[PDB]
Amino acid sequence: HKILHRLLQDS
Amino acid sequence: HKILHRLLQD
Amino acid sequence: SLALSLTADQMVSALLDAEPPILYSEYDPTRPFSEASMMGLLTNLADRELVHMINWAKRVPGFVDLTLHDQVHLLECAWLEILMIGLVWRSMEHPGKLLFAPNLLLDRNQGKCVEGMVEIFDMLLATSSRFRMMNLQGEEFVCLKSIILLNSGVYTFKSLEEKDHIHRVLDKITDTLIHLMAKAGLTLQQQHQRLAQLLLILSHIRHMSNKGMEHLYSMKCPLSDLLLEMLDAHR
Amino acid sequence: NSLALSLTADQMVSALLDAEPPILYSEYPFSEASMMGLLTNLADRELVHMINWAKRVPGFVDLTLHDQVHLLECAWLEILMIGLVWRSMEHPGKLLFAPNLLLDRNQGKCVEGMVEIFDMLLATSSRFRMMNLQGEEFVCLKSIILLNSGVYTFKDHIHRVLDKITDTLIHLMAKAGLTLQQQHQRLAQLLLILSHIRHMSNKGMEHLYSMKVVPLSDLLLEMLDAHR
Ligand SMILES: O=C(O)CCCCCCOc1ccc(C2=C(c3ccc(O)cc3)[C@@H]3C[C@@H](S(=O)(=O)Oc4ccc(Br)cc4)[C@H]2O3)cc1
Numbered sequence A: 001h002k003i004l005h006r007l008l009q010d011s
Numbered sequence B: 001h002k003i004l005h006r007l008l009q010d
Numbered sequence C: 001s002l003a004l005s006l007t008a009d010q011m012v013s014a015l016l017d018a019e020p021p022i023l024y025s026e027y028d029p030t031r032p033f034s035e036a037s038m039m040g041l042l043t044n045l046a047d048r049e050l051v052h053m054i055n056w057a058k059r060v061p062g063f064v065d066l067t068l069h070d071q072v073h074l075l076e077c078a079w080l081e082i083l084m085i086g087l088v089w090r091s092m093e094h095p096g097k098l099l100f101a102p103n104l105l106l107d108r109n110q111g112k113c114v115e116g117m118v119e120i121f122d123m124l125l126a127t128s129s130r131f132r133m134m135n136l137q138g139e140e141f142v143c144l145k146s147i148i149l150l151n152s153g154v155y156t157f158k159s160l161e162e163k164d165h166i167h168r169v170l171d172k173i174t175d176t177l178i179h180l181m182a183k184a185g186l187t188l189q190q191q192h193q194r195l196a197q198l199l200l201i202l203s204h205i206r207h208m209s210n211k212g213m214e215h216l217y218s219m220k221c222p223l224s225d226l227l228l229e230m231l232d233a234h235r
Numbered sequence D: 001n002s003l004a005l006s007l008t009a010d011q012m013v014s015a016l017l018d019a020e021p022p023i024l025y026s027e028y029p030f031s032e033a034s035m036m037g038l039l040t041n042l043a044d045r046e047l048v049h050m051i052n053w054a055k056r057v058p059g060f061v062d063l064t065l066h067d068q069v070h071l072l073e074c075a076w077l078e079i080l081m082i083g084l085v086w087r088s089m090e091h092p093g094k095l096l097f098a099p100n101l102l103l104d105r106n107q108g109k110c111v112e113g114m115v116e117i118f119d120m121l122l123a124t125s126s127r128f129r130m131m132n133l134q135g136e137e138f139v140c141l142k143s144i145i146l147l148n149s150g151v152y153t154f155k156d157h158i159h160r161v162l163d164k165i166t167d168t169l170i171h172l173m174a175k176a177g178l179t180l181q182q183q184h185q186r187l188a189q190l191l192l193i194l195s196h197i198r199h200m201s202n203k204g205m206e207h208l209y210s211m212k213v214v215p216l217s218d219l220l221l222e223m224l225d226a227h228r
Helices: A003-009 B003-009 C008-017 C035-057 C068-090 C118-134 C138-151 C161-183 C188-219 C225-232 D009-018 D032-056 D065-087 D115-131 D135-148 D156-175 D180-208 D218-225
Strands: C098-101 C104-106 D095-098 D101-103
Touching: A003 C035, A003 C068, A003 C225, B003 D032, B003 D065, B003 D218, C008 C138, C008 C161, C035 C068, C035 C098, C035 C225, C068 C098, C068 C118, C068 C138, C068 C188, C068 C225, C098 C118, C118 C188, C138 C161, C138 C188, C138 D180, C161 C188, C161 D180, C188 C225, C188 D135, C188 D156, C188 D180, D009 D135, D009 D156, D032 D065, D032 D095, D032 D218, D065 D095, D065 D115, D065 D135, D065 D180, D065 D218, D095 D115, D115 D180, D135 D156, D135 D180, D156 D180
Parallel strands: none
Antiparallel strands: C098 C104, D095 D101
8 A cells, every 4th residue: 555545545 | 979970971 | 437528618627726836845045055955855845746746636637537556657657747847837937947936946056956957957947948938828737737647657557448538538638728729819730730849848848757767766875755655666 | 941841741741751761680589688689789770771861851951960969869769669669560469670570578578677668669559550550640750759859958940840740740630531629639649659759768778778788889889878
C-alpha cells in the first residue's frame, strides 16, 4: 500500500 | 571538430 | 461514465474550478541561500503541491473512472511534468524568471546554487517564453495539464478497456481545445496549427521531466515519504 | 526566404517520401555482447543515411550548420526509434530491426535493462498498427521529430515549417475521408505519441551512456556524447 494509493483512496 | 560537420557538408 | 457526457464549455468549467491554489514557500529573504537550503525550499514546496495535485486529479473528468491501480500509475509517471507545466504557466509574465511561489521568484543565476540545475532552469525559462509568445490562455492551460495526466503513463500500463476509456477522454479534451480556439476567432487552418504547436510542447515537457527526474534520483545519493515514493517509481 | 514554405501539401508528401532512407541489413543464440554489437553496428550505418535524409527534409537546408547539428544531436535516437516502430508495425510482438533481424521481447532480455525499452517500443508499434498509420503520415511525424525536439534548446523559420507539416497531415486525413472532428482527433493522437517517443529516447540514452563494452563508432560516440 503506497502513500499515493491511500491518498487516492481517502474519502 | 565533429564528424557530424563533415557528414552535413559532403 | 459522466465524463463523456460533458459539453465543451462544461469541460472547461470543470477543469477551471478544479484548479489547485498557488502555495507559498518558506523563503526567508534574510537567510543566505545555499545548495541545501534552496533544494530544501523546492522540495518542501513540491511536497505540499503533491497533496493538492492528487486531489485535483480526482476532479479531472474520467480519472476516477479508472481503477485505483491505473490512477496510481498515471500520477507516478506524470507528477513532475505536472509540477513543471504549472511552474511554467505562473511564470509566463515574469520574463527571465521562474515564479516558484509568489515569494520565491528565481532567475538562472540563482539556479546555479544547485550544480546541474541551471540546464533545467534554462529549459523551463524557454518553455515559459514559448507560452508567452503563443499567448497561452488559462482555458488552454488546464486542458494541456489534464492531457499530461491522462497521456503520460498510458503506454506503460486482459484490460485494454481501461486504455480505451482514457483515449475517449483524451479525444474529448482535443474537441474542447479546438472549441476554445474556434470561439477565439481562429480559422480552421489556425485551429489545427495551434493545436499542434501546443501538443508538441508536451514533448519538451516530457524531456524536462526525464532530465530533472534523472538528477533527483542522484540528489538522493529533507524529503518527505510521498515524494520519495513518487521518485522511486521511476527506477 | 525558404522554398519549403511554397510547397503544396502533395509536393511536401512526395518530397518526404522520396527522401526516405534505405532499409539496411545486419550481419548474416545472442549473448549480451553480440546483441549490442549487432544493434550498435546497425545504428551506426543508419546514422549516415539519416543525415542525408535530414538534408532533404524541406526547410532543413535553410538552417545554419550549427542549428542543423543541434537538431540531429537532440533527435537522432528518437528518429531511429520511430523508424524501427514503423517497420515493426506489421510484425505484432516483434521488432524488425532489419529484414534479417526480427526479435521478440525474450531476446531483448539478453541485455540487462533493455526489455523495458523493448516493451515500450512494442507498445508504440501496436498503437501505430491499431491506428492504421499510413506511410505518408509516418514521414510527416518523423520530420516533426527532427525539427521539434531541439527547437526549444536553442526558431521562427522552424515553427513556420512545422506549421506546413501540420497542414500536410490534415490534408492527408481529409484526403483519407475523415471528418473535421476525426481529423483533429487523429492529429492530436499522433502528436501525443511523440511524447512517448521522447520518453523512450531519454530512457534509452540513459542506458547507452552507462555502459562504456561494444565498439561504438566515433560519430555514434559524439552523437551520444551530446546527451551527457
Ligand atoms: O532521498 C533524499 O535524501 C532526498 C531526495 C528526494 C528529493 C526530492 C525533491 O523533490 C523535488 C525537488 C525539486 C523540484 C523542482 C522543481 C519544481 C518544484 C515545484 C514546482 O511546482 C515545480 C518545479 C523545479 C524543477 C525541478 S528540477 O528538474 O530542476 O530538479 C532538479 C534538477 C537538477 C538538480 Br542538480 C536538482 C534538481 C526542481 O526545480 C521538484 C521536486
